[model samples]
Target: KYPRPHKKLKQLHWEKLDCTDNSIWGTGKAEKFADDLYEKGVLADLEKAFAAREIKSLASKRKEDLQKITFLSRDISQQFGINLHMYSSLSVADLVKKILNCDRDFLQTPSVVEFLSKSEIIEVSVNLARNYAPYSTDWEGVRNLEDAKPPEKDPNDLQRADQIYLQLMVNLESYWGSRMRALTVVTSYEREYNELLAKLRKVDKAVSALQESDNLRNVFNVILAVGNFMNDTSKQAQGFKLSTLQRLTFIKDTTNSMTFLNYVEKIVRLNYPSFNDFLSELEPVLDVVKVSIEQLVNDCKDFSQSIVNVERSVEIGNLSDSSKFHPLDKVLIKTLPVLPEARKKGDLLEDEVKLTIMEFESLMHTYGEDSGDKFAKISFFKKFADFINEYKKAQAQNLAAEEEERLYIKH
Candidate 1:
């Protein structure tokens, strides 16, 4: 949503310059090279407008001006590639250097570069981030499955060979050719800007004659201020936040982790496809591991409930007549008749009972093994369980709120 900073300057120069009528370079008639480049589409729309006939006249006559224009264009196109739309009045070399310096964090960290190169992480992460909004739209209950077709078989490896060859060529073309094209467009804009500056200086001298020297300085100062306003922190942050039209790696990683957790829930409920099919076809193997960890969580929840029940039974003295008597209570009641008063007996039995429950919980927990260093294993699972619990609690709260809204609407 930002307007170009040099738009007024460009317009003023475009109106003042006479590139089309001026015939300075000895290419027969003085058809300004700048005008010719614009007509030929070598120059971009904004640059073409700025480097009009009169502007080209000033640049065409001066050898220094011509060389500067060409040098700026060529170097910009050859170095850091950018499109013409963003080139405008900025010096190509300076812009490239600024970008390189600003993004030095990405360049200095070799580990980050290596991580980005990981095909599995990139593919999975991108896919997950891309699909997040769609999945979240109807995440509460079962939704219709996507109907993606399987890859078709190839005959005699001919199709496979052709695909590989074409893919390599396309990749190389993208890596260099497209970037070069963008660079060319950007450089052309810079060339036009330089040409316009020269004409604007001449126009100032023609109009004021005496103060012409200060004309260009005033115009450029305005251009710089405008550029800064457009690129200020608030504007840049707005652009960054709105640019999530495509998937980013961080979003993808988070989505994949969440999906794996869901796969686990499905497995525990015995509602999803079988483990064999799930493992073979369910994108990532990590989902299966997630499911296993989730199963352990469900078991632990049951164990916790068992301990609570035991504690409750011990707190209340023999209630043989109560229909709530569990089978475990029968054993307690049978021994209570011959035992001392409930307070004395319970006090003596507390440590042993607590120890027995602790051992039982530990036994259940020991079913899983950590693949990492021994010292860190227990803490790792604890964190994993805590994350899942939090996710579930938040999900439940959201669902509850939504249901409440639905009821209000119905009423």
Candidate 2:
């Protein structure tokens, strides 16, 4: 196995910067972050600006320096929320999210009458982009500055609510609270069920397209041939890992104006024009970048439980007198029928998901990529997704360069 090639810029700046240190966010994370920025060429742009005297000392005290330092930490964290951010579309959903995940004092702090009336931006927590103040602190001190009373904060809301809900709910396998939880599952199931079904179909479409699209197949053959020829003929193989595609953007000429990907596409344009239309094959795969198969599988599993969930709750609620337990009276006819349809659709989606995943797994192996870690993971398609974005970027640059030269040299 080839060792990971060492990056050019050493991890010196992590120590050089005087940013506040935490076990969660320090040299260990900073170096990894720096390496990513280097690969993305963001670090090169920062280095260029620094050399141009747009930056002063690399200490955290300097604005540009702190911007870079904090930028590293914050940007790394912000990107993690991408899939989570993709999950919700409604503002009210985010509001409930805020209350659900809120720290104890922050939750209780909001229950105070006047505090509830303020604008949402003032009370919102967990946004990576929103900086609180001149101070270098967050998670605690990021609350409203104008409020008359300063409130405390901790995770007591989630901590104690865990036990409070458990103790009150699960004493008996068959109990009032367990049934309520069944109802709870029933209520939350439908929209997510519908949403996940659509997602699975999208995944199925992407998997079908990626393997069968001969255009993509043609280009991969070229990428394999070109990469092997350049990396060294001794390292020639049947294929390369999908993960290595991200490195195409990092390979650059001396002035860094163009990527190796640009040259690859140029060669393809000249020598193999038929393969250049592969962009259409990759559009569906790019959409799969937001998906996490583990999470999708768990969500699918939730549907199975809730299939039984709606069945049990409706029957039990049917037993209780209509005067006393009217919960399912209005819900059963509408939901019971829908739950059966949901389960059927769930089965259809799951079958398609299994077929797609199996096909993609084999495709990974066919391409000599890791079928273990990369198989069925979001990052599997994300590699291609990012590669496509860069491919188009180089295409755009090529267009600009051609026009720039022609505009000057029509002589």
Candidate 3:
């Protein structure tokens, strides 16, 4: 009668009969078989009618095989084009949403919005300096060690000047910071997505010889991760910045206000949904520690700009007194009251930042280049093979247990 419940569809006799020699009159014999099976009560009449004669033919199967072959011939070209389109569309949508949200949010909570946005911009500035700079000047120029000469200004003078300028430009500070934060989040997502994509490609190759719904599940998981990353990161960046300005700033003391460390933890919990509250409760602290390592790139740029007026005055000494160094001098004077507070904040922030850098160095030392190279070889076949092996073993064991239980119940 009905084949064993655990038997695969392809292994079932009834299904094989539709493709055997007796049904090889191409389209005609297949249609006859469908109609005859319906009359014999083997298939429902509606099902027989719905089954297309051409669809059941060996020629039709061959046609599908040919189409698959054609697809393989140009697979890379097609896949690459699709990927480019996906990236472009995703980027445009991301850009538009951010612009609209920023505009709306800025109008509603100007201060917090400004802060987040500034954080992003500062990130951008750091990134540009570390990555884009021709020399090892800042973040953009990080690897540009060829010209890593020590900056000319004394450390204290540079520090003093940056503190003055940043306070003056505090209004735009959040805007920049938020922009850079978004980029950092986006880059992080891209890295993870690329890894998942590599795994999926391997899975596709491994399952070319087999058919199973588990393969579909594997594909779905990869897509879900990408979608979740995009949606959640955007939301977190928006909310974190808003809350910082609204709640964190005005507290009189540590007891009343959220400490910056707590703020970091809260945002991590907010952004990453898969993070288990109980298992990884330490995520926020760890994330803050990690991010602090990268914070110097932000501060170094500030240090460079702090002495803008003084440096300019030294370079071009012929200007009027007011034009030459007067404005910068005023900035220097106003910064006196909050200098101690700033020093406290800076020292606290710097310790975390330095720790992060040291940890990162250790990580690189341990798994840096060799692990990275090995990771690059990831493919769909390898990933899928592992998944299938696990899946098949689990399914077989499940079925065998079910069969044993039924026999025991019968006895």
Candidate 4:
């Protein structure tokens, strides 16, 4: 009933079976989709077929086996590169596709040379090569079984292993070659580099707008002066927490239901018309403040480290001894040039975000805000962004009153 889904395949091409949340290092969700097969005994079932040199056994159970194969980590990668399920997964091809059809900046992660580097899965393929495809690899055991004294115990099983290995490699060679060619251009490091830079620029722009804008500073002054005017020195503050803005609507006027924020806006329009254009200054901060500085810092570090990781993986790939197990490297020959360049780009972006963070902190301190270190880095921006919105609404009301006054009407 389940392999029936295979017959409906065209785009799938007889190869498809699919998760993982934590990528490139762990099979985060693979157990539910693809990894569970091994622990679930499905791999043993397939191994029986693999040992017998027949794939017919894969769908041998109809419902039960197919259900196991179809789920349990339906399959997914990164530290995570050397993960067991990543290599052992039935849909390892999916990891390849994730790189081929989508990089997510991990396009170059699983090194061609290092991919076959180690793991039980590596041992599985290594044994397959030793017993069945020695011509495709070099191993200590290749000649041991060539003409063994224990009689090559099951030469018949060896022959089946050989036959399956030959067929699989024949197809693998063709598939790898074609895919390797298609990827070099589509998943170019420069594309990812350019994309990373745009992200850094956005972060930089957010900090600069809040730190350097005269209009935003002007608006802050209005809030400051008003806070100092009515409150006593004991209740007054040189600078206020952003959360104080949240209390504005709560302190309402009993006679008219007008909020303190409403009064602040009324004063702003009459005493400070220049404050009208500050919203333009705040537009970028409002958008950027939505993301936390800690998260941004964490992401940038990973972003730069990814380039370093890819570079190191490539170095290992170039140093790999098993050329046949990783012929994909030959076609990847020129990618070496791209790695250092991307690492440089990543390094620069990392520096840019770091400096912007310091700039953000200093800007807050300049305005007498000592909460920069105590609160979330973006906390001020969040509170201020909400204040801006409330301020805008307040203006709407202030404008209504001004219109009435022009008509010579008194409330």
| Model 1 spans > 4 angstroms off | 1-259, 262-343, 346-348, 351-355, 368-411
State the displacement of the C-alpha of residue 7, model 3, in Å, after optimal TM-score superposition. 86
In order, the Cα lDDT scores of the candidates are 0.32, 0.53, 0.34, 0.54
**Winner by TM-score between candidate 4 and candidate 2:** 4
CA RMSD (A), model 2: 23.4
| lDDT ranking of the models | 4, 2, 3, 1
Model 2 agreement with the true structure over 1-411: per-residue lDDT tens digits = 211323333334444445656644454666777678778878666555445333334333334322332312343224323423432343432333342333233223423212222233122233322331222212222233243232232212222212111112111112333333433443445666678877877777777777777877677778878788878768888766776777787788888887888887777777888786778777888877788766777777777766766566556643222232212112333345556666676676667667766887787676666668744354677777787787788778887887898889986
**What is the lDDT, from 0 to 100, of the residue 276 in candidate 1?**
22
lDDT of 1 by residue, 146-262 (tens): 332222432122222122112221212222222222222222223333443333333222223212223223222332343345466654431121112111112322435333333
lDDT-superior candidate, 1 or 2: 2
Tally clashes: model 4: 19
CA shift at 293, candidate 3, in angstroms?
A: 6.1
Candidate 1 CA-lDDT value:
0.32
> Model 3 over residues 1-411: C-alpha lDDT tens digits?
321222222222353445445555455665777667656766653444344443446567445433421111143324333423422333333422333343333234434333333433233345433222222222122232244354332222222212222322221232333232332222223333344334333323222222323333333343344334645655433122112222322333345443332333333334543431322222222222212222333553343233232334323422212222211122222223333443344444445445444543443333222223333222212333333343344345445655787899999
RMSD of each: 38.6, 23.4, 30.1, 15.6
TM-score of each: 0.15, 0.50, 0.20, 0.55
Give lDDT tens digits, candidate 4, residues 221-299: 7777877896887888777666677787877777765788888788777778777677877788677765667666777
Give candidate 4 misplaced runs (Cα > 4 Å): 1-188, 316-324, 327-334, 369-375, 401-411
